[PDB]
Amino acid sequence: SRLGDFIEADGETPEDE
Amino acid sequence: RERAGFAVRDIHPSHYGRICPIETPEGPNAGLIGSLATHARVNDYGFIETPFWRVEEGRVRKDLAPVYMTADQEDDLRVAPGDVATDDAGYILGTTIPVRYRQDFTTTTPERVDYVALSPVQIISVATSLIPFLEHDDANRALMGSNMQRQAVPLLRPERPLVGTGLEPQAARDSGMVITSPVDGTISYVDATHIEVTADTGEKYGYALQKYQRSNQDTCLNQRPIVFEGDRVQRGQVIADGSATEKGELALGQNILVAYMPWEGYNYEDAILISERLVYDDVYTSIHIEKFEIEARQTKLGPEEITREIPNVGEDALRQLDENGIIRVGAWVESGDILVGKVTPKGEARDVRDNSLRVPNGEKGRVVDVRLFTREQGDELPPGANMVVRVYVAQKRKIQVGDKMAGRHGNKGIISRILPCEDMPYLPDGTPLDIVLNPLGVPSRMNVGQVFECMLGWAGQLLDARFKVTPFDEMYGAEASRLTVNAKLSEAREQTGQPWVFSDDEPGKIQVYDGRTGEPFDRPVTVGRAYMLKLVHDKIHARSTGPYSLVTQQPLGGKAQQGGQRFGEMEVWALEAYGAAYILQELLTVKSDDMQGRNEALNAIVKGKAIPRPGTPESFKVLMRELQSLCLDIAVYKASTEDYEEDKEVDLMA
Amino acid sequence: TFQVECVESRTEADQGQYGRFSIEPLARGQGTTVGNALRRVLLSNLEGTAVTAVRIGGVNHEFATIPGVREDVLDILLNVRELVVHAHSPQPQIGRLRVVGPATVTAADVDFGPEVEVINPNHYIASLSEGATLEMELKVEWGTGYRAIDRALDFLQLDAVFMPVRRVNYSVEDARTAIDRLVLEVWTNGSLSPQEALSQAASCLVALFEPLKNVS
Amino acid sequence: TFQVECVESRTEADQGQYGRFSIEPLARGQGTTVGNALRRVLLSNLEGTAVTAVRIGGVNHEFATIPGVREDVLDILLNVRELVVHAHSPQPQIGRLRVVGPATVTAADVDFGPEVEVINPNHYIASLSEGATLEMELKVEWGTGYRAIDDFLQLDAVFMPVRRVNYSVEDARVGTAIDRLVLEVWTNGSLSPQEALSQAASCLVALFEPLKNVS
Amino acid sequence: DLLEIYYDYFREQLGEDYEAALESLRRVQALLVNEVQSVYQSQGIDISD
Amino acid sequence: DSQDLLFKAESLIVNSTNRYHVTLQIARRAKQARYEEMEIKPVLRAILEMSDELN
Amino acid sequence: REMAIELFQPFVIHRLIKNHSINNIKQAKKLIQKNDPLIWDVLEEVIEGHPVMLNRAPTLHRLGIQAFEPILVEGRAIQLHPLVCPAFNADFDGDQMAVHVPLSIEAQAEARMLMLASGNILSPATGQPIVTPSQDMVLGCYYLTAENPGAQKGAGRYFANLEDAIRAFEQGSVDLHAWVWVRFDGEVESEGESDEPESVVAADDGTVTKTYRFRRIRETEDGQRLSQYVKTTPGRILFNNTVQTALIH
Amino acid sequence: AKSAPIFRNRVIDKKQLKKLIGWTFAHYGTAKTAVVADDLKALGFRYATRAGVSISIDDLKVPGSKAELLESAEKRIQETEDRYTRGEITEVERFQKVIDTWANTNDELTDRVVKNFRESDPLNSVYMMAFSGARGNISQVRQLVGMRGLMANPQGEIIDLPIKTNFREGLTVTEYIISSYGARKGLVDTALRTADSGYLTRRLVDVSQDVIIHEVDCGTSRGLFVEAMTDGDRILIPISQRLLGRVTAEAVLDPSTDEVLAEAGQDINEDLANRIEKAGIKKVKVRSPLTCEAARSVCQKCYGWSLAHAQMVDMGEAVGIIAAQSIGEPGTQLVFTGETARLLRAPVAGTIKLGKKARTRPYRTRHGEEALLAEANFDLVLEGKGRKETFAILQGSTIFVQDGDKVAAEAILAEVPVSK
Amino acid sequence: ENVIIGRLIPAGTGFK
Ligand SMILES: [Mg+2]
Ligand SMILES: [Zn+2]
């Protein structure tokens, strides 16, 4: 387990488009 | 972990009486973590010792004090186990006695025995010492039961076992949750949070009890009084008890009516069928307290404010806030309910943005504590934070389909059906059973001890008694456990007056009827009182679309962040062997990291059209960029159609 | 044709009631049908009265305590939930309790109206120390079986158990053509007599099999 | 308060009727109660008629032969134990068969009285060759349930009008725990499955009625 | 080395390289398949060949 | 019923000599079905139709 | 239901938009969030005929991932058919499974036609059956078809056919393990039999009744069979009748 | 269809159910096999519940001769140790003798357990659920009602102290430790075996990932010879099980006449495999991926059947992945001279007529006794009271009885081996 | 490699 696998990505959720 | 091998993870003949040969983890940690035995201790050099009684001319000198000894010391002596039987005073009975000499098992005349172990449970740990009829179990199932005894959940009303082992009052006095009176006097004040005892001739002692606190594992650390006001109390008498103790001693499960027989497929392969009494009688219900946290930080745009002026919300969802933006103590919160209301200054009045803390999906309960910590109040807040709000939410969980139930002898199961008490099999007196267990799981797993406890527990219920049987109890007779159980059952039958309790043709079996039709089963079945435990852990998870990883743009993993399930390479192989090509291609691109095909697929599903063809997933482009960044000129090419043309390098990143 | 007689009737210390009935002559296996139908209806489809809600003055959730009261709120709820009552009006009722000072609060301290009656005025509820006041308001409703909370202000809901009959047993004996004699034993909690639970179960069965008598 | 609806009804070639009924809404646990009680009463406590004894001219024991008759006594007895009859009088009746010559002896050849109706008129009994005469006397009685036995040959008659009963309990939940009973009844044709259901319900109501007004 | 032994023997007994290689590979293949199948069936496991 | 669909599926898998090819045909047919129907579920109707066409 | 309402959310949204009065995606999402009664009806009419793939964590062979048809159940646990447990090597003592849902028409067709559990009968590694009944099913069949000399009430009685024997057992006239005779015409395999007829009796006609250990065959002189009576147990009759009913239907 | 079922008038264990399922699939298809399996599941679940099968302590029946068997074994052990103490035998012969004694006592006790189960109570729940093949074995009933036997040290050495109790009687502290040794060994074995099994499966997948069926026929005349797998006298895998799904590369012929049983290029089903086994061909030449000359793969004719469907493989089937998975799936599923020899005991009382016919060389056996080692296969001749002896020795056998002796009832006569 | 890039695998229904 690493920290980098718990951070979301910046973008528009497919749902919000 | 990668360097430890077969030799290190095994049992060494020098572990005898110092490290338990049973209690270990299962999996990558098997044999690498151990447990100290019951009587073992560590001396001032750092070596584990264990006690022995001296034997002079075949006589065990229990008058003298135990002689402790390390592994190297007890290699030249002939040491006998703690299950050897001695007669009046101390002489050892028998003509041949098992001993250990130089890490080997031999037999000698009982005039050449040097030391004898103090107790028959000197070889096992404390968790394994709590399993009655342990010598009738396999070692793997003993391991399972000892490990699962430490995953039991404190229940709403705990209850002592009927077939306890004798170490229960000692396994609870060290956790420091049971209160005993150090004074031989009277009790003057009893309360849910305070106890006071006045010495017969002396000062008053006062104790405060913890109430509905929270452990590291979200269980409850309650403490309740036992005594009443104006009660005569002796020194060393139990005054208060913990969340897993009844009256002095450990109580991790409950005693319930059990029958060993198959149901209509609901007992299949370790599944468990229980009755509905375990739900409405509040058996196997527990309190779990969870903690939620919200942070008020300071952004470059501005600070964050905790208030009820939340955007895009109506007054129907701000009922239980305390006019400061934080929920009130004693409020029932359902899923998605706001706990603390927070606003962030976004940059683009109509400027605040909502990131208030809410209950996670699938969580509900009462709010029991709302603690606030701010730098003004003299609290050590994080470097960049300006308010830390912590909310504690408690709930009562009942036994339900999907929960794990266990016994002390290694028999685990998952509940698959909860029958109304008029569908469960019933006894020749009209009593429906509480749990039906499959007997198919008993002989292949060699945990016969569960079939002894049940029977003794049956007698214990019928005789209003509680039995303390110690492991390895066959040093007194040829078959001590069976004879004691049969004698107890016969005594219960004679005392109660009901002949159907115990039968001589089938000792442990009595007639049982069908609650659905009223017809008796073809043959009598084994029924008794079994001590079952409810294990911890919130595992159900599902996802359609959520957050994605930073580099690969693949869905995150984890229940707490709407994570996806991993489709490893073994699953890819399985799909390749089926001949599936479209399921595999949809899994690999459209449902994981085809950054443009995900939205198209979702839009096609919502609108009802057909899902379009995918493109190149983002992880491949990331890999090509990384390989180029490694000074490799790797590229993708499109072959030329005609003769006198060059192949053209294709630009994926467009 | 057959004659149903009551052989024995007792009353336990907790005001629960026991009744044994002899039914004969049935017809070579009709005893099992009758007995099992009666047992299923008695244990499953009888309406009872139970305390469905409670409000304890001074608290607002189940995980609290009252100063001077030996029991915690959750224990008081678990004791009130097992209080047996029998109502005469087909409406929910409110019973009021207020005890002060050194006392052992019991079911006799609950004062319902003239309609609701407490079967056991010895049910333990709480122990109050000197200077402590316990004030409660209970709500009783009609129902059947186990009702789970569905989640009227500050009243703590309870998982109600309307089960007026606690144990049913039966045995078919040979009363010799071969004839059957059914022996039916009923244990109730005292809300209703065993004879009135047998009567209600028979009424439910008759109403259950009536629509199939001549419609088909 | 529920509604019984016959979803399906059939009349198989052997004149054996079939029916399926949906009963709903039932409370939780009442589907099993109703289904099991109805099944027991239908299969064990309904009255019917069957051939109880038979006398054959030329034989004296079950393991005997009849010249010119393809079958022996045992085969004829088994073919007659499943012969379905329905009597209109509570009095035992006697039927007489006397077929002769080449012929296929079926149920229609039995000369029962006006009060006895043979449900299946073409039910194979025997096959007579040239110059063979089958002289038979059948006795019909009123009874309930399959009844095995310990001049006239005693038979293990099947008095059951109902041949088979199955029931299943579904969940008719709309949105508590409601149940739905699906009851399948196969009858030998002497009664329609709705008449068998009506008689079973009448027997159950008569059993549970006296347990209501006194104790 | 069994492969080398078989190849050396067959490259003379026969005289052509291609057939010697084929026969050596065939014998080694049979040995390997039989050994693996025997090991698997010792524990009572069945897989097709 | 579900059983009916299962029997029809097995029926189409045989007489086709290629489970993959007949899965592709069922997919195509169901696609056309839904397309010219949006104007039961597509794959189900496709299997019903193909079974009824096998006579 | 909790898992299904999240896995099939886009399909539920589409059917709410199309077959109901829902205007936009936001309204459908808030309706789902508030757990409207219509949501469950839409989900139930969406998931029917929509295959879903179940996988166990160690996928050692291609039978570790199999397609099923979903049925909405109330609870937190996935209900698995007991006959597919050996294929998954799964037991109900804490094991967990992962559920995937195909999206495209090709994917659903492939799941139904290739990966469906009702089509995975033989083991792809050896060709042997893998959906055979095991554990309690085997024990029940064995008990039904065994022989119990202790309980043989009603032994020796003759029956017209298998249905007659089953009805007699259902009533209680004949015990489960009684040795009775049933008039069955067909192929019979009886262990512990003898190919040599035990007793041959020629009557006052051209008919011989050979009595084997478990059979009694009446045969015309230099002719064909006229009747066959099998000596069996009503449990074996029930087993064979169940098999025959499953095959015929 | 069209195949009427046979009335199975017999008991139905797991083998019979598996046979019935296979027959149903072979004759009726895959959805009637599914229906039959569901019906059998329902029937078994119903009548395992009506039976009321349960487990008790008296259901675990120990034979009543366990005590006398243990007493006799202990008497033999005492004689052996007294011989060792007096210098008549060395230490490794005392060890060998006591190990063989307790292994023979364990085998005899297991036989007595099985006979007692099959004789007194043949409907016992433990016997019913272990003999039918539902949930159980014979190595587990042995440890429940028999005797645990000889165990091993954490290093591999056989502890000469055996476990003489079951789980019904209850072990002692010493037997619990000796059992925990092996329990731990197995636990650590499983923990460390899972990674190796996964690694092997991955390596297999990568070695043979490109083996996809692309061709219909490579047009060859090569294949291998399939024969039964036998351990000398005994066979382990019959030829019919090894000949299923293969394709013949040459026409096979019955070895009694000129009747052909298969032509060239014909897949073999269960019926043809059984016919070949019945007629005793003992060798069949078949096509194979070992000998097919295609383009970097196998063809449809050299592969043969796909075993999951009982048909020839389809086009574009990844048979390499299937092979790797098939080899790797059972990867995680991976005491001294007992019945591997055979003692010969004569149940007669008569004089010895060995004389000097066979080559008897004096020999000291694995125990402390002295006997005669024989390598010349010779038929034993002994005056066995009424009639003579027809016993046959094997090469390398060890005979204990020499001439001029008096043999009694069931006295030890010889030992025959079965095939530093 | 069609798995790594994300194409239809050349086996099964993606054969041609
Ligand atoms: Mg598991
Ligand atoms: Zn080839």
CATH code of H109's domain? 1.10.132.30
CA distance D52 to chain G (A): 15
**Distance (Å, rounded) from C-alpha D177 to C-alpha C146?**
12
Residue of H nearest to E39 (CA): H334
Q: What is the DSSP letter of B135?
A: G
Q: What is the maximum span of chain D, computed from C-alpha positions, in angstroms?
A: 74
Residues annotated within a binding site of G for Mg(2+): 91, 93, 95
Per the CB < 8 A criterion, the answer to whether B298 and B345 are in contact is no
Residues annotated within a binding site of H for Zn(2+): 218, 292, 299, 302
B556 CB neighbours in chain A (<8 A) are 5-6, 8
Cis, bond preceding D25 (omega within 30 deg of 0): yes
What is residue B281's three-state secondary structure? coil
**Distance (Å, rounded) from C-alpha C38 to C-alpha D130?**
63
AA letter at B414: I
| Joined tokens for residue B239 | 């005054």
Note which residues in 1-16 of chain I have CB less than 8 A from chain F. Answer: 12-13, 15
| Joined tokens for residue B52 | 């022995």
| Strand bridging mode H361-364 / H341-346 | unpaired
**Distance (Å, rounded) from C-alpha B421 to C-alpha B515?**
8
Helix (H), strand (E) at residue B368: strand B365-373
Helix (H), strand (E) at residue B186: strand B186-190
Residues present in chain A in total: 17
Who contacts H92 (Cβ-Cβ below 8 Å, separation ≥6)? none
Q: Which residue carries 């060995």 as its tokens?
A: H354
* Sign of the alpha-carbon dihedral angle for H67, H72, H75, H76: negative
Where in chain C does DSSP place strands (E)?
A: 3-11, 17-26, 47-56, 85-86, 93-100, 103-106, 117-118, 124-128, 133-147, 156-157, 160-162, 165-174, 180-188
**Distance (Å, rounded) from C-alpha B652 to C-alpha A16?**
26
- By CB neighbour count within 10 A (0-12 exposed, 13-18 middle, 19+ buried), where does H112 fall? middle
Q: How far, CA to CA in Å, does B596 sit from each of B336, B553, B563, G136? A: 30, 11, 20, 51
Whole-number Å distance, alpha carbon H178 to ligand 1 midpoint, is 27
AA letter at G14: H
Phi-psi region at B371: left, alpha or beta (left = phi > 0; alpha = psi -120 to 50) = beta
**Distance (Å, rounded) from C-alpha H63 to C-alpha B607?**
74
Per the CB < 8 A criterion, the answer to whether H344 and H413 are in contact is yes
Per the CB < 8 A criterion, the answer to whether H301 and H278 are in contact is no
CB contact under 8 A, G105 and F10: no
Sheet holding D3-11, edge to edge: D3-11, D17-27, D178-187, D162-170
Which of H136, H119, H134 has the alpha carbon at shortest distance from H61? H119
Per the CB < 8 A criterion, the answer to whether B463 and B488 are in contact is yes
Sheet holding G207-211, edge to edge: G158-159, G180-183, G225-232, G215-220, G207-211, G199-202
Which of G61, G122, G126, G128 to mutate: most E Cβ within 10 Å?
G126
Q: Which chains touch E (3 or more CB pairs under 8 A)?
A: G, H
Q: How many CB pairs under 8 A join E and H?
A: 30
The 3-state secondary structure of B318-360, one letter per residue: CCCECCCCEECCCCEECCCCEEECEEEECCCCCCEEECCEECC
Q: Which residue carries 């919200």 as its tokens?
A: B294
What are the two backbone dihedrals, phi and then psi, of residue C147, each rounded to the nearest 5 degrees?
A: -110, 125
Who contacts H72 (Cβ-Cβ below 8 Å, separation ≥6)? H105
Residues present in chain G in total: 249
What is residue B577's three-state secondary structure? helix
Per the CB < 8 A criterion, the answer to whether C67 and C126 are in contact is no
D4 CB neighbours in chain C (<8 A) are 211-212, 215-216
| Strand bridging mode B105-108 / B67-70 | unpaired
Q: Which residue carries 């147990």 as its tokens?
A: G233
Phi-psi region at B562: left, alpha or beta (left = phi > 0; alpha = psi -120 to 50) = left
Helices F2-13 and H30-50 sit at what angle, rounded to 10 degrees? 140
> Which residue range forms the structural domain that includes residue D140?
47-154
Note which residues in 594-633 of chain B have CB less than 8 A from chain A. Answer: 598-599, 602-603
Whole-number Å distance, alpha carbon B153 to ligand 1 midpoint, is 20
What torsion, rounded to 10 degrees, do the Cα atoms G211, G216, G217, G221 define? 40
CA distance I9 to chain H (A): 10
AA letter at B255: N
Q: What is the DSSP letter of H157?
A: P
Per the CB < 8 A criterion, the answer to whether B552 and B618 are in contact is yes
Interchain contact B572–I (C-beta under 8 A): yes
CA distance B420 to chain D (A): 8
| Joined tokens for residue B473 | 């109890």
AA letter at B84: V
What is residue H68's three-state secondary structure? helix
E40 CB neighbours in chain H (<8 A) are 330
**Distance (Å, rounded) from C-alpha H42 to C-alpha B627?**
58
| Strand bridging mode B224-225 / B237-241 | antiparallel
Per the CB < 8 A criterion, the answer to whether H220 and H287 are in contact is yes
The residues facing B426 across adjacent strands are: B432, B513
CB contact under 8 A, F19 and B579: yes
Who contacts G196 (Cβ-Cβ below 8 Å, separation ≥6)? none
Q: What is the resolution of this structure in A?
A: 2.5
**Distance (Å, rounded) from C-alpha D149 to C-alpha B507?**
38
Who contacts G9 (Cβ-Cβ below 8 Å, separation ≥6)? B544, G32
Who contacts G14 (Cβ-Cβ below 8 Å, separation ≥6)? B605, B606, B607, B608
F26 CB neighbours in chain G (<8 A) are 109, 113
Q: How many CB pairs under 8 A join B and I?
A: 40
CATH number at residue C59: 2.170.120.12
**Distance (Å, rounded) from C-alpha H87 to C-alpha H96?**
16
CA distance B650 to chain I (A): 14
What are the two backbone dihedrals, phi and then psi, of residue G186, each rounded to the nearest 5 degrees?
A: 165, -175
Whole-number Å distance, alpha carbon G95 to ligand 1 midpoint, is 5
Ligand nearest to the CA of G57: 1
* Sign of the alpha-carbon dihedral angle for G196, G197, G198, G200: negative
Per the CB < 8 A criterion, the answer to whether B276 and B321 are in contact is no
Residues present in chain I in total: 16
Q: Which chains touch A (3 or more CB pairs under 8 A)?
A: B
**Experimental method of this PDB entry:** cryo-EM
Per the CB < 8 A criterion, the answer to whether H199 and H91 are in contact is no
Per the CB < 8 A criterion, the answer to whether B229 and C102 are in contact is yes
Q: What is the DSSP letter of G232?
A: E
Who contacts B47 (Cβ-Cβ below 8 Å, separation ≥6)? B70, B71
Helix (H), strand (E) at residue G108: helix G105-113
Per the CB < 8 A criterion, the answer to whether B155 and B165 are in contact is no
Whole-number Å distance, alpha carbon B269 to ligand 1 midpoint, is 9
**Distance (Å, rounded) from C-alpha E12 to C-alpha D192?**
92
Ligand nearest to the CA of G90: 1
B286-397 has which CATH code? 2.40.50.150
End-to-end CA distance of chain B: 45
Ion ligand 2 residues within 5 Å by Cβ = H 218, 292, 294, 299, 302
Helices D30-44 and C30-44 sit at what angle, rounded to 10 degrees? 170
Alpha carbon C157 to chain centroid distance?
18
Whole-number Å distance, alpha carbon B435 to ligand 1 midpoint, is 20
AA letter at H239: I
What torsion, rounded to 10 degrees, do the Cα atoms B419, B423, B427, B430 define? 110
| Joined tokens for residue B507 | 């000792």
Q: How far, CA to CA in Å, does E28 sit from each of G210, H95, H232? A: 60, 43, 21
Q: Which residue carries 């050349």 as its tokens?
A: I10
**Distance (Å, rounded) from C-alpha B597 to C-alpha B619?**
14
Whole-number Å distance, alpha carbon H219 to ligand 2 midpoint, is 7
- Chains E and A touch, contact meaning at least 3 pairs of CB atoms under 8 angstroms apart: no
**Distance (Å, rounded) from C-alpha G150 to C-alpha H120?**
12
Who contacts D175 (Cβ-Cβ below 8 Å, separation ≥6)? G37
CA distance E37 to chain G (A): 13
Alpha carbon B238 to chain centroid distance?
27
**Distance (Å, rounded) from C-alpha G99 to C-alpha G83?**
18
Which of B550, B498, D211 has the alpha carbon at shortest distance from C2? D211
**Distance (Å, rounded) from C-alpha C122 to C-alpha B202?**
37
CB contact under 8 A, B105 and H154: no
The residues facing H248 across adjacent strands are: H286
**Distance (Å, rounded) from C-alpha G213 to C-alpha G195?**
9
Which of A10, A12, A15 to mutate: most B Cβ within 10 Å?
A15
Which of D179, D45, B424 has the alpha carbon at shortest distance from C208? D179
AA letter at H243: L
Q: How far, CA to CA in Å, does H172 sit from each of B85, B98, H23, H200? A: 12, 10, 50, 41
User: In sequence order, what DSSP letters do the residues of D111-152 get, joined into one string?
Assistant: B--TTEEES-SS---EEE-TT-B--EEEEEEEEESB-----P
Who contacts C18 (Cβ-Cβ below 8 Å, separation ≥6)? C8, C9, C10, C11, C12, C185, C186, C187, C188, C194
Who contacts B142 (Cβ-Cβ below 8 Å, separation ≥6)? B22, B128, B131, B134, B409, B410, B447
Who contacts D169 (Cβ-Cβ below 8 Å, separation ≥6)? D31, D32, D35, D179, D180, D181, D182
What are the two backbone dihedrals, phi and then psi, of residue G62, each rounded to the nearest 5 degrees?
A: -65, -15
What is residue F5's three-state secondary structure? helix
> Which residue range forms the structural domain that includes residue H141?
65-192
Residue of E nearest to H326 (CA): E47
Q: What is the DSSP letter of G77?
A: S
Per the CB < 8 A criterion, the answer to whether D99 and D76 are in contact is no
**Distance (Å, rounded) from C-alpha H31 to C-alpha H95?**
60
